[PDB]
């Protein structure tokens, strides 16, 4: 029967996404439920600890901005459209050479480990936790993408063979 392949492939894409997806949901909820003092805590610093800088450049580069500059990256969390951008994030639109450059700079890096960053600043904590989950979710979504598109081709064939 026809659904056998469609079902298999669909479950296959979901088994991959479920490993990373409760983390993304937990992580968006982390960023939403911050008190307004912990944006001032990460912002105020003149000379930041280096892990703070690395987590604030990480999220800024992921999220929307081309700025490495401590003066420009720290204010982005006080934009009125920060949570609108994160709620209406498209992780698909992020381009493939660029993704692998982000994992090289931040993911692989020694001082971007979650324990080393929360040690430095728990107020960086929520922001690093989204940056990790998201950048990992774009990586797993793009990785299941060749089989996700073959699914939407099979679904289209499966409807058309049904209307025949």
């Amino acid at each position: 029967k026809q659904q056998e392949v469609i079902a298999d492939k669909q479950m296959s894409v979901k088994e991959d996404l479920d490993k990373v997806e409760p983390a993304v949901i937990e992580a968006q909820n982390a960023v939403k439920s911050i008190k307004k003092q912990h944006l001032v805590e990460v912002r105020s610093m003149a000379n930041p600890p280096a892990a703070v800088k690395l987590a604030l450049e990480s999220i800024c580069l992921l999220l929307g901005e081309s700025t490495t500059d401590w003066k420009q990256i720290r204010s982005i969390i006080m934009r009125e459209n920060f949570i609108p951008t994160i709620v209406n994030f498209s992780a698909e639109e992020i381009s493939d050479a660029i993704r692998e450059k982000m994992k090289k700079n931040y993911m692989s890096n020694p001082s971007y480990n979650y324990e080393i960053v929360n040690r430095a600043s728990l107020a960086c904590g929520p922001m690093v936790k989204w940056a990790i989950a998201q950048l990992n979710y774009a990586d797993m979504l793009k990785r299941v993408e060749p089989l996700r598109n073959e699914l939407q081709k099979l679904e289209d064939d499966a409807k058309d063979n049904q209307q025949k």
């Binding site: 912990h38 805590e41 105020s44 892990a51 430095a120 600043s121 107020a123």
Partner: protein, 439 residues
């Protein structure tokens, strides 16, 4: 031989340093510029022409200390009146403030901006370390420059120039005694830095002197200016006795090695005898037993470990002024043979003492005056678990009710560092507890 270079950082450390300078200047009779009329009078140093002639001399007079301050008022004060040729205008230093009561502020925020110009004077001061001996640094330890700038300099002194002895004179209340619940938070890291990088600290409790200044000395209007004047008298009674005249004239090294006989610095609380209302209004000359007894008056001995307790390793009394040998040996033997006081059971010896024999010749004016008999005291207790235990306790007494580490990290420092340093103070408690019950 003579004394040695002195570094004055912070506003307390400059006014203490000016008070001490006036003491050296006043006994000397030094002229403001010149050209000086005596053959020759001792006071800073054993020449007095061309003035200061402080071991360092010549040109436009090369100074024997460095003052660094926020306001031109002190440079105006020296440039207009006396001390004017006793310093050089380019090493009389004056800047600005922007202030924070935060560790991260002196360590980073102003600390990376003002460093290279003052560094260049530190590097030259370490090149010309007159008197040979070491660095006398007058602190500046409790605030944001006190906590931050001192922690950065202490390491930088120690790693580059650790062969030199570093003497630090500190004004700071014993933990929890202060009304401020948030005062330990900036001080926790410096307290931790001190563990590695401070072999030698002489500590005054500003709260203990405030109580002495108001009640023993019976001063109607205490202010900062008058307190720092009184702690200059301490610094002078110690230092000005051991410079080169009628004394044992014990070296910096010789003292340090008696203070610190085993790992980790042995910092004592300082006290001072003639901070008494009778003395200020002028009274008897006194015998060495009586100056002792004045020093062992209520409020003048510490109540920290409980007055007779805490298991003293030693007390060291520094007898300035003319002295009789019978009188001094009985002066330290009587307390021991009374045996009110508590010592460690392995070592009830207490042979630690300074006996010197020059009188103060200073003129009437201040709270010091011309005398025959003086003393200063350094008290060492083993059972100091109580200090560490209060630092540990007081940080959490805010912290458990509501978290308050935010601002000390908002000025640019790591979060976990604060509480790890706190955890250290908590493990220190039991190390100084066990030696406090001795063996």
């Amino acid at each position: 031989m003579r004394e040695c270079i002195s570094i004055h950082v912070g506003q307390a450390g400059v006014q203490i340093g000016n008070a001490c300078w006036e003491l050296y200047c006043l006994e000397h009779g030094i002229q403001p510029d010149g050209q000086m009329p005596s053959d020759k009078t001792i006071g800073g140093g054993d020449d007095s022409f061309n003035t200061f002639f402080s071991e360092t001399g010549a040109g436009k007079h090369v100074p024997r200390a460095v003052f660094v301050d926020l306001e031109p008022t002190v440079i105006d004060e020296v440039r207009t009146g006396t001390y004017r040729q006793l310093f050089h205008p380019e090493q009389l230093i004056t800047g600005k403030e922007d202030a924070a009561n935060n560790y991260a502020r002196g360590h980073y925020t102003i600390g990376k901006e003002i460093i290279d110009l003052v560094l260049d004077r530190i590097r030259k001061l370490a090149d010309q370390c007159t008197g040979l001996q070491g660095f006398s640094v007058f602190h500046s330890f409790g605030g944001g420059t006190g906590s931050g700038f001192t922690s950065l300099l202490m390491e930088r002194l120690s790693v580059d120039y650790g062969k030199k002895s570093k003497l630090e004179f500190s004004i700071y209340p014993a933990p929890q005694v202060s009304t401020a619940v948030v005062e330990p938070y900036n001080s926790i890291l410096t307290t931790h830095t001190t563990l590695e990088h401070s072999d030698c600290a002489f500590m005054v409790d500003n709260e203990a002197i405030y109580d002495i200044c108001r009640r023993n000395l019976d001063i109607e209007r205490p202010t900062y200016t008058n307190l720092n004047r009184l702690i200059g008298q301490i610094v002078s009674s110690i230092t000005a006795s051991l410079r080169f005249d009628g004394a044992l004239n014990v070296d910096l090294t010789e003292f340090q090695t008696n203070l610190v006989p085993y790992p980790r610095g042995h910092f004592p609380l300082a006290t001072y005898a003639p901070v008494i209302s009778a003395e200020k209004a002028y009274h008897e000359q006194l015998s060495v037993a009586e100056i002792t007894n004045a020093c062992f008056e209520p409020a003048n001995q510490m109540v920290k470990c409980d007055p007779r307790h805490g298991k003293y390793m030693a007390c060291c009394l520094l007898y300035r002024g003319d002295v009789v040998p019978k009188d001094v040996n009985a002066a330290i033997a009587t307390i021991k043979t009374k045996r009110t006081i508590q010592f460690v059971d392995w070592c009830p010896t207490g042979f630690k003492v300074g006996i010197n024999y020059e009188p103060p010749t200073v003129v009437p004016g201040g709270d010091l005056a011309k005398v025959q008999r003086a003393v200063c005291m350094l008290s060492n207790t083993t059972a100091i678990a109580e200090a560490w235990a209060r630092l540990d306790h007081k940080f959490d007494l805010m912290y458990a009710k509501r978290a308050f580490v935010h601002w000390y990290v908002g000025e640019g420092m790591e979060e976990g560092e604060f509480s790890e340093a706190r955890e250290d103070m908590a493990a220190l408690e039991k190390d100084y507890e066990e030696v406090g019950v001795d063996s």
